[PDB]
Every structure is written in C-alpha cells, then in structure tokens.
Symmetry: D2
Subunit: 507 residues, 4 copies
C-alpha cells in the first residue's frame, strides 16, 4: 500500500544506489529503475502559458438567485445554471498575472487574471476575464504586438518601460488602460481583495431567441485593496509568492473568499446616442446609464491537492459557452476565441479536454477520435464502435432537438479592414482621472513620471499628448514629474551597481 | 444518453452547417463547435513507430504450469507469474512487420514483431521479440544503419535491394538472418500460424539469487505456415491487410489462437566449448544440446474495441522486467533497453505508462510527478501530498524489503570497443541451408537471385563470398541464378511501364 | 570531408562496437556516440498528415503568358506572377492519395492530391487542390465525419464500404462525387496522366479592387489515363509505389511532366439564373457557359534530394494567397483555411515556415518571435533588436503602403446555421452519368454494385434513391447489380481464407 | 527591406485591423494574416529547463597556454584546443540558478550554474558545472528526489525549508553541500564575481592512451563576492533580475568578465591512502595535496542578439567530449550524461544540434536523418544521397582512422547496487566549517537556525546529528539558534498578513 514502485508496478528495493560494476564502478544499461525515473523527470515541464504564466487555482461553487437584478433571469437568458434559486454549480477558478513567467514576483505591475470555469448541466462555461474592466487594445490583431512590448526585451530579458510606452505612443486607445494600470489599481494587494470582469462584451439569449449585450462583473465580499509601488517593493523584498500564499492559506484556515456576480444588460444595436462603442473593450459602461444587476454569488472553498495536475493544466476559452450565452461583434472577443483552443492543444495537450480538471461533469458523446494520450473514447454504452461519424443509419450519436429558437442577428456591411467609427481614446480616460481620489492620482503621476524618465523624447511627447487630451491637469502633472526626475537623474553618478560583501576563495 | 455533444459537454443542435453571415455567406469566428471539432481532428495522428509501424493487437491470458520442463520452475526463476499451476496472467500482444509504415502491405518480406505484455502481480513484463530466433546484427550501434538500408530510400521513398545488400556486404554477421529472411520463412502466412522468440539472451533468477542464461520461444498450436513470394504477390493483389484481418476475424468467430511458451536454460558463463557466443543474437541454441523446456500457454481471445487507444498506443520495453527476470550481457539487448523508453516518451507521450493499455493492473506508488497530460498522481490514500521524494521522515512511499538475494554476477574486463572473440558469421548459416527442405532452398536461391540481379558487382561478389563461406552449394546456386537473371534482363526492353486505359477529359 | 562524425562534430573512430566492460561485457553509460545516434533515430518519425499521408513531391517552374484567354491578365487580377509574358515562377508540387496512411498502395480508390506552392515576389501562393473538380461535401463541418467513414474502421483498421456509404446515405450532396469516384476516374493511372483543380471557388482582384469568381484547372500535356479496378489489382500485386515510382523515374530520365493552367472567370454575385450555387464545391461550371481560359504552363523537372526534408515537410494552405488573389464565401474554402495552419504547427512544427521548403524566396520581416526550433530571427540589417512590435517610434518593420484598393464586397444577412438555398445534389450527377462513355458507366455500376452488396439495406435504399434521382437508368442498373451480386454471395460459403504453404519448425 | 511581411512573404498593408463584415462587425475566416500571426504567437513558449530554468548567456573566447601548470599540456591530455600557446577557442556560456523557474529572483539561495560550450576543431565540448565544487548527492538516482524537495511544494507552489531538510535528514552525504549552501556562498553577488567548477571527476587522455583523474576550476579575475541574506532581501525589493542585468550591462560597456581555467590532476586508481573517494562529487581535492594547475583563460565579450534563439535554446551535455577527454567512474557523472540528451530532445527539439547555437563550427557528416524541423541533411558534396548507412561499398561517410590509442581502463567487480566504501559524509564538512571566516560561520548558523525553526523535530535531530558529527561547535550553535528562534516564534501570534491600502470601487 505504501511500497515504492516503478510506474510499471515493479516494487523498488533500492532507491538509493544505481546498478554498477562494483560499488564504485561504472553504471550499466541494466538500470531500468534509473532510466524510467529520470526519463519521466526530464519531461516534467510543459511550456508555460504565453501570457498569465504565474497563477494559483481554487475549487468552489456558484449559487444562482434565479433572477437578474429584481426581475426573472429567464427574461434575458435561458442559461440553465441561472434558472433556479439556490442552484449550485461547481466551479474552478485560476487567478494570475500577465507579463512575466512562472515563479515571477506577484508584486509586479500587471492586469490580473480572473478565469472561472462553470461545470454546468449544459456543459462547461469559461468566463475568461481580468480584474480591470477594460484592456489595452480594441483589436486582437495587436495582441502579440502588445505582449511583446509588455514582456521582457529579447536583448536583455528584462522589462523596459521605454519599450512599453513605445507601443503606447502609437496606440492612443490604451490611454484609459494606462490610467488604471499605473494607478494603485495596477497592483491588487491580493486575489481575495480584488474585482473581476469579463472585460469583453457578450450576449444573453432567452427563450425567444432574443439577444442583449452583456458585461460581467465580480464584486469581492472581502472588499478591495490595492498595493502601492512603495508597499509592493516592501513585500517583494521577502516574498515573491505573496498572492498565491494569501489565497491558499485563507482557504486552508476556513476563510473562504466570496464574489458576487453582477451583469450589465444593454439592448442590441449600434446605439448612436453614445460617444463610445459598446463593443469597444477599452470602454466601460457607466453605472448611472447601465446599472449593475445581481445574478449570483461564488465561493471558493477548496485548494488543489496537486498544483500541476489541476491549476497548471487548467484550460479556459472564451468560445466555451453554454446554451443561453453567445458572442458579440466585439472584435477583441472573437479574436480571443481562436487563440485559446489553438494554444491549449500545444500547451496542455491534443486531448486536454479529457483531463479531469478540464472535462465536463456530465455525459459526453462525440465522434472525435484518437490524438496523443487518448485516455478514453467518447462512445456510449451499446454503440456500434465502428461508427464514428454523423449522420449514420447504423448507429452513433444524434443531433439535439432545438427546444428554443437560435439567435440569428442581422449583419450588414462591406468586408473591410477598418477601425470602429467611434474610437474616443481619451474620453473615459479623463473621466477616470478626475473621478480618482487624491492619493490615487498622486500614485498615477508618480509612476508615470518615474517610468517615462530617460525614455526617448518622441515617445514622451506622444504620451504627454495623450494624457493632456484626457485631462489638462493629467498631462501637466506628468510633464513636471518627468522634468523633475530627469533633472535629478542628471545630478547623480550612474556607476555599475555593486552587490554583496567582498569575499575570498576557500581553496 | 445518445445526444451528440462537444467535448465541453455542449449538446450539438446542428452538426451539418457552420455559422455564417447568411446561408451562403462567410464563416465567422463565432464557431466554437466547428473549431473544437476540427482542432482535435487536425491532431489525431501521432508519429508512427520508427520500426514495426504496421501492426495488430489482441487481448489474452497466460497460464503457467508451475514447472519448467519436468522440474519445478522455482529451481531457475522466482518470477511470481510462473510459480503456481494454472495461474492465469492477463496479457496484451501486438504483432507487426518491420520495414514499412502503417497501412503498408502485410505480404512484404520482413521479420515479424511478437510483443507480449504480461500484467503480473510484480508489475508489468514486456517480452519484446520477433518471429525469427535471430537478428541481422549483434551490436545495437548498427541498428539505425541496418534500418536505413532496410527502409525506403531517402531519394525514391521505395525499398531497394541494392541498398539492402550494400549494408549486408559489410556486415557478414547478417548472413544467418538473410538465409532465413529470403527463405519462405521471411513471409509468414499469418500471425496465428507463426512462431515467436525473444531473440536476445536473458537471465532467470531464483530464490538463491542464482542466474542462468535464457532463450524464449513461442510455439503456435495452429502450426506454422509460410507465404512464398508467388503466393504473397497473389494475396497482395486484392488484400494489403490480410494478416490483420486474419487475426481479428479468427478471434471474432471464436477461433482463439494459442502459443506454448518454451525456454532454453543455460549455465551462466563464457562457455569456451562452443564455436559461438551464447550472447550473440545472430546465433541459435541447438535443441540437441539445449532442449526446449515447456513453461506455459498463452491464448488470445479478445479484440480491441479501439485500435488506436489500445494497439497503437501500446508500448513495449525490454527493460520492463519483474523480479525473477534479469538482463544478460547481450550487447544487443542492453542497447535495446535505452531506445524503447526513449522513443515512447516522444511517440505515445511523457506519461504513456498512465494509459490504460500500458498501466499495470495493480498498486502504483511513485514520487514521479507532472509531465504533459498527467491524468493522475501516484500518491496513496492518506499520504502527505507535499512529500514527493525519498527518503522522508514525514511521509511518502518506502523501499521494499528484499525477500531474496539480488543477482550480482562478476564482471571483469577492460573498457573497450571491440567485437566478440567468436563471431563465426557463416557457421550456423550453412547448417540452416543444408537442414532446409528442397522447396525452402529453391525459394531462397530464387529470391536472392532476383534481388541481387542488377546490383553493383562489388556487392554481389561480397555476398557470394558470404554465401559460399556458409555452404559451397549455397554460393554456387545463387551465382548461377544471378547470371541467369542478369542475362534475361539484358535481352528485353526496359521502357517506362504504361498504366491504365487511355481516357479523355469530361469537360 | 567524408569522415563520419557525430552531430557534435566528433570524428567517429568506431561505428561498429559499443563501449563495454570487455569485448563481451555489459554496456556502460560512457557511450555518448551510441546515445546521440539512437536518441535522434528514436525520433525520426513525425506524425503523418491526417489526410493525404501517402505522397510524392517534385520541384519545377511555372511560365505565365501575361494574359488570360485572349485578353490581358491584368483585366481580372493584379497578381504579379501573371503580369509578364514568359515570367517564370519557381514551384513545388506534391501529389497524393487521401484515405490511407504512408506507404499505402497507390492503386487504391481515392481522390488524388494536387498541391502547388508558388514562390512569387509577393510571397508564397498555395493552390491546394485535387484531380477531381468537385468534393464530397459542401460544408467543412462535415469533413471529420467524411474522413472517419472513408478511413479504416477503428475496430478493424480496414476500410469498409458499408461505413463509407453509411455516411453517404445521409449526405445526398456527395452523389456527384460518387459518380466520379467509383468511375474509372477514381483511380488515375499515374500522377503525370492526371488532371488538377482548385475545386473551391476563389476570387481575382484587379487594379480597381474589382473581384470575380474563379475556378482553377490543371490540364496535363501528357494526356489523361485512368486505371480500372481489374487493372489496379494487377498492379497492386507487385507494386504498391507505382505512382511515386512513375513520377520520379520520368523526371530522372528527362521526361518532364507538364500542365497547362486554365481559369474559369465569373462575375461576382448570387447569379439567380443558375440551378446551382457557384460557391458550391460539389458543382462544376459548364464550359459551354463558362469557357476555360488559358493562363500558363507548369513544368516539373527536378526530384527532391531528400524525400523527408522536402516532400514530407511541405506545408500547403488555402489561406496562403498573394496580392491579387482573395477568398470567396465558399463555406468549404474558408473552413479549410483554418485547418491547414492548425495542423501544420503540430505536424511540421511551430516554425515550419522557417524551413527551406516552406520558406519564401524573398524578403521576410516579421515581429514574430521564438517557437520551438527557431533557426533565425525575422529582423533586418541595422534594426534595433529590442523592437519586436508595431507600431514603434524607435525601429522595427513598417506597414506597406497600398498601391491598389482592397477588395471590399458587400455582405448582408443574418448570423445563421443553414444550408444553401440551391442544394440540387442530383442535377450534375445525372448529367455526368449520361455524358460518360460506355466503358466508364460499366465500371461505375460494377464498382457500386460490388460495394453496396451485403451492406445494410437502409443504406442501399437511400443510395439507390440518390442514384435514381440523378438518372432513372443509373438507379436501376445499380439495383440490378446489387441483386445479382447479393445472389451470388448467397450461393457461397464464407469460411476463413487459408494463406500460405504449410511448413514445419526448423528447431 | 524594412517592410512588414508575413512569414509567407506577404507584404502587410494593415497591421492594425482584422478583416470584418463592416468596421464594427464580426471577424471572418478570411483572415490569414491574423491566423498565422496568432498561430505562431500561441506557441512561442517552449518548456523551461527542469532545472536551471532562470539564466543568462554570453559569447566569448578561450585562450590556451599550451601547458598545464609548469609542464606541457600534452603530457596529460591530447585535447587539440589546449596544445598550442595562444590558441583561441570560441565559447558560449550560460549562468543560472537551480531551484525556481524562469523570471524567478536571482537573489534566491541556490547553487549557480556555470555551463561552457567549447567549439573546438574536434567538435564541441560541454563543461557543465556549477559555482560550488561539490553537490548534494553522490548518486544520480537521487536527483529527482533532491530536486523535488528543493523545488516548490506541489500543494502550495512555494519552497519549504521543512521539505528541503526532510530529504537532507535521510541524506547525510549532503552535509558538506549544506555547509557551503547556507553560508554566504549560497548566494553569489553576481555571475562576474563567482567561481566555477566541473564538480564531477573527469579523465584526461594523452598520446599514450594513459588516463588521469581531473577536476576543473574557474577562477574569476574580477574576484569573488557573496551576498548575505540581509543584503539579498534589499536587492530583491526592487530587482529580481540583478544578476542577469549585471552581466549584460558589463559586457555592453566593455567591462568583459574573465576566468582562469585550473585543473587538478590525479593518478588513476582507487587511492587507499585517502579517507574519501576521489570519484565522490561531495568531496573536494585539498590543494595542499593536489595543487591547482593553470590551463588557460576565458573572456566573455559579446551579448546574445536574441535571448531565446541563443541562450534559451542552448543545450549542454556532460557526454559531449572531444578526443583527449573521457569519463570517470563517477556514478553521478555517468548518470548526468543520460539525462541531458534525454531532456534536450524534448525541450529544445529532436534536431536541437542543428540549431546555430548548438551546432559545431566545423565539418559534420552523419547518417542521422529526419526528425521534426529538419533544416538540413548531414551529407557531403558529391555523396550518393541514397546511402545513409555504414558500412557501404557505394558511398556515405567513413570512419576516422585512430591517430592515438583509446583509453581502456581495467574494470573488475560484481554487478551490484551498493554505496561507495568510503562515504565519510561529515569529514570535509567539519573542516570547511572551521576554515570559514567568522562572518561566514555567523551567516551559516543564522540561515540554518531560521530554516530549521518550526520544522518537525525528527528532521531537526537528524540534521543536528549531522552537524555535530562534522563539528561539535557546529551542532551546538545551530541547536542554540533553533531553541532561540522557536522561542521567539512562541511569543508571536500567527495571523494572516495584511497587504496593501484599502480602496473603493470606481464604478
Ligand atoms: Cl479590507
Ligand atoms: Cl480534447
Ligand atoms: Cl463530433
Ligand atoms: Cl440501426
Ligand atoms: Cl496448418
Ligand atoms: Cl509515465
Ligand atoms: Cl520514484
Ligand atoms: Cl510521520
Ligand atoms: Cl512559422
Ligand atoms: Cl508580425
Ligand atoms: Cl540533432
Ligand atoms: Cl551516424
């Protein structure tokens, strides 16, 4: 029961010594125990996520209220997990950073990942969102460009603020994101004291087949706490895993984190009465115009018994929708859908949906076959095994009858490559700057000043142009901050940093 | 229960049409059903086995007699699967060719694979052998050289007899193998009417820790049938899957194939009284000097419900030995042990031993962790999960106490790269030529003559030298056969072959 | 210069013996030469193509005439490779079957692959087509269903006509394809005597940005030859590589195969004057209504120096278009575009476009970085290496200015999952049946009769219904053929086939 | 020249917008530019090294003196790169940590990697060593056990000192390593101010075939600087890439780091006059008994132009030896040799030795073929391409004639699994404790005290037993440190750490 074996089932008698010619002689190839043990060890590492590499997972449950806001949930969506009051749905959630790889400090400035996997009766639903309600760009084509500038340089393997704002200098749509990111909101204190949002615009489909535009929001019961740059540096001094440790230990002691699910519902259409496009993920929907409607509550109450098998292998996709949910023409959203399935086949495996953490908690009958590491076949009991196709007069799985009309929105336009007609990259950025608290603006100006100091002046002028366009005080305060820090830099001594205490050889 | 779903568990309502803008318009990225279905389809194929690609599998059982020959089995080995009379052990067997890839004709000239996986109580045991009792080479270093000459040319993608015997011209040790291969024995009629053997020399270890040299043999109850070149060409005309079809359909109708397991036991040592090395896998052990000892009987009685998941993903390794079995200093055998584990991590997967077909049918407790497509963790119930190492004062699996002395043979010599001192590459080759039946020799001479006709004369002279060294009649008959066929080739017309009936465009 | 080395550059002194303790002793781990050699050998095989696995490649050149038909080529397209008379463009072509894997007989019934890669000055252009002008299905969602029924059964690993027509019974749109496939046209005699076509509908864009619907055709100068089933069985008896051998040997002796490129141009639009949809790939365009227009001629004159490095690693994609070419709303075509890139990253590699055979023969400047086996970085001379994104004020590659208007067709409709309004699955099928020659119809009826004999009657009735709808005589002849063949089967006895000559053990 | 293109060579006109139906409509599959760009991006990440993931690389040169110490280098070795005075050999060096993954703080306690690749005329030579002269274990079978305890826990994803010393409690041979590791020597200030060593025992072979035991040492010209835990915490606060930054910035400004290569030569044999085994890698060779002999000097003077393509893809193996160098019976060394090639085929690729950074800078002629991402074939000019095997009468690469006798040491003994007869796990550990400086001992006791505080007492007692066996004062000081720190912990209150400043929702 507790006897050490090989994966072939061979009981191991000596886990200490290799088989050699003499006690101090050479190893022979008569060492299967050694081979198998090391063969598997050499291939433990799978490639990390191209983004959101550093993360932590937790199991939990979602409770529905049966209604959206103060009116029945059936009015806007027919998603089965929402229909009944008190209906519990098992979930797995992974929190994460964005920029740097695994085992990187969780005190770094970054958006935070907030992915929730709903194991519903209509299959799985992945809500792949972040902490901030918006994103840097509005077109998915710019994503590898954004990440490359955000990630460590291919020449130094270190993040560069110059490289970061170099891309921002040509991307005015990221202004609103920067205003949030370089504020204290760019470094959440922990995952428990953090907001969540689907960022992109989605759609809800009801019994009638009617669709409405939808925003998702996670509101923490624990409240919201942010980490200033001074505070972040202090934590990082002795702890580069503080956020992972915070979530795990809280669940371990019974202090279960909770989030309330809110939704913003909007009538389908262009809405020309707005100065912004509702399909722009660099835009928020004002609560005074589009109030938040309560849907349910999620509680995380169980830690993974194995980080790799569950959290690391967990795979989330925006296309993973259940009946009642649908896409919108958010160009960012539809772009995402492609990459998730694409990257997960490579990272987690060809049959990654057959893994316990990714597999749905219900019946599955597909004609999909084979693939590497195929653990099971999606046949049903009594099926003619030789039938792996549809249609078939002999056997095999059948289509599901429609119990509700499909959502068929009207789409008209020319096949073009053009930006949206209402960019407005400075509008909401200025609003958020003014609506900030004093200590939040101070942190924003301080961070931007320290970041843009020493950077190419062509970049500086363009960023100052963007900040000024959002708010005059915004632009002026950053400009003065830059001039001040560039002046102080000029009056020091930039010799190479000396580390450690001088020592002498022991031999 | 029979409703078609995605692997996310989403019930599919339309498996016929993609989601498009209009019934005849362009596809959108709002097609997760399409994406997932095709995403998995594009990665169905895993790399085929580098050798023995074409094959067929079958489940079965092995019954032990409790004795070896007419004396107790405990005298020579302490392998648990042999100790009790009537003791049944589940097995999975894969038959195969060698040279060409999957879906290649099973009527081709090749050695035949005969791999048996024993799911014993001491873990799994893989007996990876062939139909012929010997092999081409005596050193594993020559294996990629042998296979490259055997396999289709890198310039034509077609097998070449000139390339084949080009390598044989510099490899006199393959003479005995050629004598068998180009005889009718090179094309077994089917897998059911075929012999089996471990080819390499192994070792049996008893209760005392004493070791003896061992040869394995599978004797078919159905008898032995071979396929002549004329007969093989006739079958190939309408059936390139005849051997796979033969085994499957026989089990399907209840005609279960059976093999008796025989063993040849030899005292450990150099044995200088022999003209051949007992560790040379190009050598057989004469029955008159080393009689065959019955051990048990194997019956194959169940076909795989899925060829890919079971047969294709099946992984066999010569190092996979249970207690009571051990290696010998067969340089070919020890070389094999490395490649099997090496190639299976790449082909089947990093966690290929976690697959149902490869996993042992007992308890497994290892400190091995992670790897791609990790379906489970080798922990035991109640274990401290954070302990994945040995030794440990906290928890984790423990070593197994020795219930019998380990086999510790004496090894003396200089670390050298040298061939065995008793090569004798022509001895047994000549014996087998003379011991052949008339119709077997006729086929041998006919095949060699047709193969060596047109080949470079430097190769021909060297091969004729080898054949003559084995037997004077052997060499002379092949020489005359070559001269005859080269003369007949000279008197024809070698225009490019014309195929099919002339046709005309339909448009 | 000719000295055998390791891939580390180490001169090999002994390629015959492994390093062991004594000439007949055990191998040590002191064998890097052995390790590296077998380590690479164990991973020679990459996964075969999920479809069109068996194939052969050839290098060549394409000559443009500068005009389409009798009018300038610039009138309809601005593709640079067509503009000048006598303009030569390097090409690589791979011919292939469809159903079975590598090293499978080329005498089997299948559509034949005809993929051409154009190394133009505007980058690469892949024309991924077949010999037949149409395909089985009109929606890419059905592709894995089609292939699964076409491919060997997951229970027997053998193709089954019952499984094939089981899918066809629920797919009436495949009727026209079947009419061609089970005719002599289903087995081309060789690749040189074979037609080629893009099958799908494409678009040509000129200087004005105007688009026109387009069909591609390859007409062999050598003529067209088809292989009857009786002729195919005779060839298969002694040669399962006859088509591969035919192309290679012809090029080797100087007999270079040639194809003339024809195009069918059609005004963009719905075209309600047709009984078929021009975007349906199960439909041909009648020459009497849409004449074939000559474009150029292609000549294949060089064989690959390495089959694997060139032919096996070759990657073709329908999305790989140069300026002047574009997509259509062919639901089949757009579906293909997804799968090629998806499967090639897995099969050939993440950086497969960096391989010599797939890499363009011009300038390449991308912001794409890394990936496994990254051989080079897409930077230009003098570039700031730390800039791998766009836009950038510092450095990096810049966008290309538009020298011609982009094609922006009007698209209106509801986001639906619905079939085309003009299916007409039997129309052209019947016409082709009547337009057949007598020997072509006889072969068609003979093949269908032998295939549908013994098959479940539910399948038979549906197929007979489809054949009859195309043509009354068509249905009746097949019906009579089935009744006749099912009757002769009833007067047989289905015992297990006996193979080979009885033999006796040699030991 | 600077125009942005696809990897197909297609000039990109719009790198900002995806192709959609209308400026704000859905994406179509008519987006190859989008597809290819994201398809490659989704697969940028390769699996990180299972150990030494975090690292930095640098190009350089090595100058030989032509002699070892004060006597000719030819006396002990015939390695070509050492024979001539002033002989320069191109090198690539990668420095690294051990425990945590990529982008992990370089201020962490760990051994430091020091891998050097020599591009010699006899091929490549990899000297894969660390900064410390010894290692934790003496048998490679314990390596995955060691790393698992050292690496973050599978339940918390955080390193645990309890898990670390849990393994050490059952591994007394790691005592000497711990004495160094928890001293200031466990955190080198930077890579430039750091020693290097091959750790394992190697062999040098001369013109006579005579072999001698060998230790390698890298002595930094810049001197040696270590980083205390207090100093490390201060650096980690604002910089987790300080060591990577230090090496890069130094080379960039012209301050090239230099190391002198020293060797320790010892007569081959058991050497019964020692209280330790010279093949034990947990043992150093006393300079007073075995003086350091100068060999040459290495200078690093060029930074990688691409971190991934060069540093990340760099592959080092202990088996990669040139003529004149050889193995010893160091059970640790021979174990390593297996794992490097095994893990690098998986990590870097099947053809990783074909990559520019790993490929030798000389002639390469192998019979190795294929493998994924095969960029070239190892054929020579004029070779018959169809010959990919040895021997061959037709063509192909030939063996190299021996210009010097091979080293063939005598090996006698029984095939056993047993530890060395002279373990002595506390001897040198105690000596190093006394030879330490006061500030070095203080740091050692301080680190051990803080680490073992709160840990299971069974572990504590075993470690205290090990420390005491090395030195009585050693054990007592740690014991007092533990008692003191466990007492101050008892006078605390272990509430959950509170992070960040309280904030409020912005919406
Ligand atoms: Cl709070
Ligand atoms: Cl899957
Ligand atoms: Cl399916
Ligand atoms: Cl039925
Ligand atoms: Cl018989
Ligand atoms: Cl495994
Ligand atoms: Cl283990
Ligand atoms: Cl315990
Ligand atoms: Cl690529
Ligand atoms: Cl790009
Ligand atoms: Cl390689
Ligand atoms: Cl080789």
């Amino acid at each position: 029961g507790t006897t050490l074996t090989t994966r072939q089932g061979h009981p191991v008698h000596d886990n200490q010594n290799s088989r050699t010619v003499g006690s101090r002689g050479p190893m022979t190839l008569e060492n299967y125990q050694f081979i198998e043990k090391l063969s598997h060890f050499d291939r433990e590492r799978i490639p990390e996520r191209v983004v959101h590499a550093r993360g932590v997972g937790a199991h939990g449950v979602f409770r529905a209220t049966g209604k959206v806001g103060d009116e029945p949930v059936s009015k806007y969506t027919r998603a089965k997990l929402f229909q009944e009051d008190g209906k519990e749905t098992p979930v797995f959630v992974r929190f994460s950073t964005v920029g740097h790889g695994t085992h990187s400090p969780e005190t770094l400035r970054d958006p935070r990942g907030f992915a929730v996997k709903f194991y519903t009766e209509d299959g799985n639903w992945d809500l792949v969102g972040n902490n901030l309600k918006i994103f840097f760009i509005r077109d998915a084509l710019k994503f590898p460009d954004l990440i490359h500038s955000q990630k460590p340089s291919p020449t130094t393997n270190i993040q560069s603020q110059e490289r970061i704002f170099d891309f921002f200098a040509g991307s005015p749509e990221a202004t609103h994101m920067i205003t949030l990111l370089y504020s204290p909101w760019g470094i959440p204190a922990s995952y428990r004291f953090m907001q969540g949002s689907g960022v992109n615009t989605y759609k809800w489909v009801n019994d009638q087949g009617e669709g409405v535009l939808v925003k998702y929001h996670w509101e923490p019961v624990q409240g919201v706490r942010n980490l200033t740059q001074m505070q972040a540096d202090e934590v990082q001094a002795t702890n580069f895993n503080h956020a992972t440790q915070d979530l795990h230990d809280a669940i371990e002691r019974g202090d279960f984190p909770q989030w309330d699910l809110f939704v913003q519902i909007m009538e389908d259409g262009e809405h020309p009465e707005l100065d912004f496009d509702p399909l722009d993920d660099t835009k928020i929907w004002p609560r005074e115009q589009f109030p938040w409607r309560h849907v349910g509550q999620m509680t995380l109450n169980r830690n993974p018994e194995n980080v790799f098998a569950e959290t690391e292998q967990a795979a989330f996709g925006t296309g993973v929708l259940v009946d009642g949910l649908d896409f919108s023409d958010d160009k960012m959203l539809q772009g995402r859908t492609f990459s998730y399935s694409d990257t997960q086949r490579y990272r987690v495996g060809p049959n990654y949906l057959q893994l316990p953490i990714n597999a749905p908690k219900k019946h599955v009958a597909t004609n999909q076959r084979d693939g590497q590491m195929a653990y099971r076949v999606d046949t049903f009991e009594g099926q003619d095994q030789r039938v792996n196709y549809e249609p078939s007069l002999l056997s095999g799985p059948k289509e599901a009858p429609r119990r509700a009309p499909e959502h068929t929105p009207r789409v008209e336009g020319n096949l073009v490559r053009a930006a949206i007609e209402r960019p407005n990259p400075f509008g909401q950025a200025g609003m958020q700057y003014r609506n900030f608290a004093d200590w939040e603006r101070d942190e924003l100006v301080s961070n931007l000043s320290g970041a843009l100091a020493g950077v190419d002046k062509r970049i500086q002028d363009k960023m100052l142009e963007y900040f000024t366009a959002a708010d005059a005080d915004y632009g002026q305060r950053v400009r003065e901050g830059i001039q001040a820090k560039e002046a102080e830099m000029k009056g020091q001594k930039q010799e190479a940093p000396v580390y450690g205490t001088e020592a002498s050889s022991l031999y």
